[PDB]
Structures are given as C-alpha cells and as structure tokens.
C-alpha cells in the first residue's frame, strides 16, 4: 500500500461493504476508509453526490 494506497483495503474495505453494513454497521468502514486519502475524498464526494441526486433541497 504505497504505489496503490488501497491494495490491502481492496480486500478488507471491499469485504467490509460486500459483507453488508448490518454486521458491518460500525466505524470499521471509517477505519479502513482513511487509508487511501483519494478513496476517502471520492467516498465523501460521491456520498454527497448520491445525496444531492436524491435530496438536494437547494444544491
């Protein structure tokens, strides 16, 4: 996790959401999320994008 920053999270953050967020409901997502900063920002960006595409209000 150096060339690609998430190649470990490619197993563990992947299985952390492939195994659903019911037994995976906890901050165990958030604890692997932080590892690749671009994945973290891409999460925050597309999370926000998914929301404005559902509940924009004025944005």
């Amino acid at each position: 996790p150096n060339r690609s920053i998430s190649p470990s999270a490619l197993q563990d953050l992947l299985r952390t959401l492939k195994s659903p967020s019911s037994p995976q409901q906890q901050q165990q997502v958030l604890n692997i999320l932080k590892s690749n900063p671009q994945l973290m920002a891409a999460f925050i960006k597309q999370r926000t994008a998914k929301y404005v595409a559902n509940q924009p209000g004025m944005q």
């Binding site: 690609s4 926000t48 998914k50 944005q59």
Partner: protein, 47 residues
C-alpha cells in the same frame, strides 16, 4: 502516483462505497457531516 491500478482499484472501491447506500453508511456519512455537506453544495465543487 501513476493512477493505473490505483485508479482502477480506487474506482471500483468508491463505486462499492457509494453504490447508492448501505444500512450503516448513514452513520458513516453523518460521522463525516455528509448530510450537512449536501446543503453546503460540496457535491458540486471540483474540490
């Protein structure tokens, strides 16, 4: 980096992590203030 395998594995990982939703992802979003960042317009920013 050389965003090649890093790009492709980032793409599939942010696709998983934003595939619509996940039932505890609501907490992960509010733990990052994301439902507030919505009304701030953060989705519309290039950064």
């Amino acid at each position: 980096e050389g965003q090649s395998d890093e790009r492709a594995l980032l793409d599939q990982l942010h696709t998983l992590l934003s595939n619509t939703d996940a039932t505890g992802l609501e907490e992960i979003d509010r733990a990052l203030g994301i439902p507030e960042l919505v009304n701030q317009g953060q989705a519309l920013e290039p950064k």
